[PDB]
Amino acid sequence: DSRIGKLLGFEWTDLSSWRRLVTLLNRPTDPASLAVFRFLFGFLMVLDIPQERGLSSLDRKYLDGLDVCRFPLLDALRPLPLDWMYLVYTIMFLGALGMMLGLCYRISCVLFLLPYWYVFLLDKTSWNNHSYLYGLLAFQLTFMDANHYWSVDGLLNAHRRNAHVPLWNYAVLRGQIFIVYFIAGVKKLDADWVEGYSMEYLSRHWLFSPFKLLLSEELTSLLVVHWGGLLLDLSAGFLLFFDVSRSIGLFFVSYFHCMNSQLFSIGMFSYVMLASSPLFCSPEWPRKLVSYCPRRLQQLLPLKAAPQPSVSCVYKRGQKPGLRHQLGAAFTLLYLLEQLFLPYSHFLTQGYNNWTNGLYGYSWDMMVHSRSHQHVKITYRDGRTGELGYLNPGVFTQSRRWKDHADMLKQYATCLSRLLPKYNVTEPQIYFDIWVSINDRFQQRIFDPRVDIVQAAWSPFQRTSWVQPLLMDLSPWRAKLQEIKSSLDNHTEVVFIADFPGLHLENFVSEDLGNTSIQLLQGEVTVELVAEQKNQTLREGEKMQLPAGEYHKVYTTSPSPSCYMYVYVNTTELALEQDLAYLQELKEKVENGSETGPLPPELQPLLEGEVKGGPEPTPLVQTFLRRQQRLQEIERRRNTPFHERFFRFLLRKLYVFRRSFLMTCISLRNLILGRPSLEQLAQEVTYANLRPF
Template sequence: MVTSAAPSVAPRASLARRLFATVDIASLVCFRVLFGLLMFIEVWRDLPEIADVYIEPEFHFTFHGLAWVRPLPGDGMYVVFGVLGLAALCVTIGLCYRAAAPVFFLGISYVFLLEQGVYLNHIYLIALISFLMIFVPAHRAGSVDAWLRPRLHDPTAPAWALWLVRAQIGIPYFYAGLAKLNPDWLRGEPMRMWLRERDDLPLVGPLLREWWAPYFFSYGGLVFDLLVVPALLWRRTRAWAFALALCFHLINTAVFSIGIFPWVMMAATTIFFEPDWPRRLRNRAAALVGAPPWPAPLPAAPPARLRRSQRALLTGLGVYVAWQLLFPLRHWLYPGDVAWTEEGHKFAWRMKLRDKDGYVRFYATDPERGETWKIETRGRLTGWQREEMSGRPEMILQFAHYLADDLRRRGHPAIEIRAVALVALNGRAPQMLIDPTVDLARVEPSLRPSPWILHDLAD
C-alpha cells in the first residue's frame, strides 16, 4: 500500500515546492510600475466626478450587508482620492511600498463599495489586484525602497507571486468568455444595438452597419476570452496572442467607452511573458548604445521540504484561488436568466452582456388612511441613479425601503411601497420586471432567490 501511494503524492509535493523556487523579478517590477501609473491616471480622471457620484446624491445604493459604508462628509472624498493618488504614485516608484499597497487597496475598496450604481467589473478587478500587491514583493528591485535600503534588494521573487498575478488576470478572461455562451450573445445581441449607436464613428462607422458586424464582434470576443490565456501561456503562440490582445483592447477603446480597463488589461497581459522579459529587452537596448548589460540573477531551486509557514501560505493561496473560481458561478443557484434577474450578476465577470432600457414608478399606500399616491423620485435620485436602478431589482428594493423609512418618519407607520418596473432586455419588448402587487417595504433583503422578481422572460 505504501508503494502504490508514493507516486501519486510525489507530483503534488513537487508542484508545491516549485511554487517556492525563485524567478527573475523583472516582470513583477514592470507590472508594479504599469499598474501604479495607470491607477494614478484613473484617480486623476475620476476627480471631476467626485461631487456628482459621492457628494451630491441624497441617497446611495449600497451592497448587501454594507449599508454602513458611507461617503465622508464635506470635502472628505477629495481627501480620499488625494490619498489614493499618492498611494498609487508610491506603488509606481516603490516608495514605502509595504504601506502604500494596503493603503491603496483599502482606499479603492472603500470607494468601490460606496455606490452600487457605478459598479464596474474593472474596478472590482483593480481592487483584487491591489489586494494581491500587498503580498507580492514587487518592491525588491527597481524601487526607491531598494535604493534606500540596499539589503532589501533582491533580483528574484518566489514563483507563487508570479503565478498568483497570472491567475488573477486569467480568471476574468475565462469567465467573461464562459458568460458569453448564452442565446442573446450568440444571436448578436446586445452587440447589434451598441454598434448601431456608434455607426457615426470615422472610418469604421460604415463597417459597423454591416449585417456581419455584430456576429464578428460577438463571436470574436467569445473566442478571444476563452483562448487568450492558454495561448499566452504556451510559448509558441504567446507573441501572437499578445498582439491579438493589444488589437482587441485597442478596438474596445476606440468603439466603446469603457475607461481605463483596456489599458489595465494590456499592461497586465505582459505578466504572461517569461519573467525576465524586461531585463532582456533592456539589455538589447543597452547593446545598441554600448552600455553594460543588466546581469541576470541566479534563481534558487525549489526547497527540499516546505516549512510550516510555507504550507500555511499555500493553503491561503489555495482558498483565495478557489473562491475566485467558485464565486462567479453562484448565479446557477438562482432561477431565471441572470441577465434579467441580476441575481449573481455582480462579481462574476459578466461584462457587457445585457442592455436594459426601462423605467420604474413607486407608489405608496397608507392603509390606515385609505390613500395611494405616486412618489416622485426626482430630487431624491440623480439621473444616472434612476437609469441604473430601473433594471436592477435589488436596487429597486433598496430604494423602496428608503422611501418607506422616510414616510414612516413623516407619520405613516403602516406605509406600503409598490413598484411598477417595465424593462426591455437586449432589444425585446418591454415587460414587467417585478411583481407590482408585492409590498416591497415588507420584503427583507436576502441572498436567497427573490420570488417577487418575475422570471418569465419573453423571447
C-alpha cells in the same frame, strides 16, 4: 528534458508530494516583468483616481445636509462627512504613488487596498468588472514581492535590490488573467450573443470600415463582433501561454483591446489589460531589452547584472521549506479555486437573483445584456387619510440601477418611507410599476404592481416572490416585430407590450398624440374607455382607434400572456414641420428672386436675423431661428481640424485634475487648521472652479 516538462515548464514528479509542490511553487524566478507591471498599474490607477472614482465630482455627491438614498452592501455602512472622504481619497493617492515608485511597498499596498474596498462597498451603483479587477489585483500585489527590481525601496535597502522572487508571484497573476478571459468565453455562450442580438448596433462604427469592403453589414455584425469576440475570449489565454503561439496571440489581443478602448468608454480597462498581457512572456524581458541599448542609456536605466540570492525562495543544494513558502502555495491554490467558484456562486445567494444572475461586477459577463425602459410609476397610499398620490420616478437618488434589482428596490422603498414623513405624509405604502425590455423583447413588468415593497419579505438567501418571470416563450417574435419596425414611415412609432393574466394597464394619451391605435397580436384583451365607461373585447388581428386626451385601460383575460402594440404619430410635430417647410419654401422663393411681392412684416426679422426695434417674433419664427442657429453650430463643429479637438481634450482633462487638487487642498486645510470666514470659503470655492484657459 521531457517534452511535457518543456511545454508546461515542470515535471510530473514535482507534484508527487506536498514538499516538492512547495519547492516548485517557490523556485527562483527573475523579477523584472513583475516590476514593470507594478509601475504601469500604479501609473494607471493614479491617472484613474481623479477621473472615475469621482474625486473631481465628490463635492456634490456626499454633500452635507442633502437627503439622498444610499445603496451600500451592508446597511450598517454609512458615509463619513465630506472632509474625511477627501482625506480617504488622499490616502488612496499616496498609496498609489507608493506602489508606483515602490517606496514602503507593503504600507502603500495596504493604504490603497483598504480605502478602495471601502469606497467600492459603499455604493452598489458604481460596481463594474473593471473595478472588481483593480480591487483583486491590489489584493494580490499586497503579498507579491514586486519591489526587488527597479524600486526606490531597493535603493534604500541593499538586501532587496535585484533579488529573486518565487514563481507563484507570477502564477496567480497569470491565472487571474486567464480566468478573466475564459469565464467570459463561457458566459458569452448564450442564445443572445451567439445569435447577434446583444450589441447589434456596434457594427456601424467607422473602425469596422475596412471589414465592410468584403462583407455585408448584417454579416459583419455577426461574424466579426460576436463570434470573433467569443473565439478570442476563449482562445487568448491558451495562445499567450504556449511559446509557439505567443506572437499571434499578443498581436490579436493588442488589436482587440485598442478597438475596445476606442469603441467604448470603459476607461482604463484596456490599458490595464495591455499592461498585463506581456506578463505571460519570459520573466526577464526588460533586462534583455535594456542590454540591447547604447551604453549611454544604460548609465540611467536599471541594472543589467544577474539577480542575487534571496531569502524568499527555496534553493536546491536539500533545504526544508519554512512557513512563508507553504503559506504561499496554499494561498495560490485557494485563491485560484475561489476565483473560479465565485462567478457560479449564484445558487446559494438567490435573493440577489433577477432576470439576470446576481449583482453586476463579479460575474465577468461583459456587455451581454442591454436594457431599454419605457415607464416607471411610483404610487403611494397615505396610511391615515387614504389619499393616493404619485411620486417622480427618480427622486432622492443618484443612479438609475434600482429599476432592475429587487434588493435595491427594497432599500429605495425604505428610504422613501423614512424621508416622506417630512412632507406631511403619514406611514405610507409604496407600489412600483416598471417596464423593461432585455435585448429587444416585449416590454413586460419586472415587479408585481400590487405588492407593498415596504412590508414585503426579502432575505438574501431566499428567492423573491414578487419578481415577474421572464417570458422566454415570446423570444422568436423578435424576428417578426423587427419587420414591423422597418415598415413604418419617418413619423409613425411603435411600442410593444406583453402582459400577464389578471393585471391591467391604465394609460393617458396626451393631447398632442392624435391618431393613436391599438392592435392585438396574441391573446384576448378587453379595452375600457372611462370617459363613457364602455369596454370592448378585442381578439387576434383587430385594430382600434383610441381617444386622444383621455384615459384608456387594457385588461388581459386569458390563461396565457397577451401581446399587443401601440402605433402612434405626433400630429402637432407634423403640423409644425409642415409649417416650417412652408416658411422655408417662402424664404427660398424670396431669396432666389421669385415672390416679387413685398415680404410680410413678420418675414422681415427672418431676413434681418435679429429682433431689434420691432415686435417680438412668433413662436414659429423663434423655433426657426433656433433650428438655423443649431444647424450652423453643428456645421461649424464638424468642420474642425484634429489639433483643435486634441487641445480641447487636453485642456478639459487639465481642468479636471486642477479642480481635484484644489478641492482636496481646501478640504485638508478646513480639516486641519479650522474653517475661515464664510466669505473666504466662497472666494476659495470660486477660485477652484475657475477655468484654466
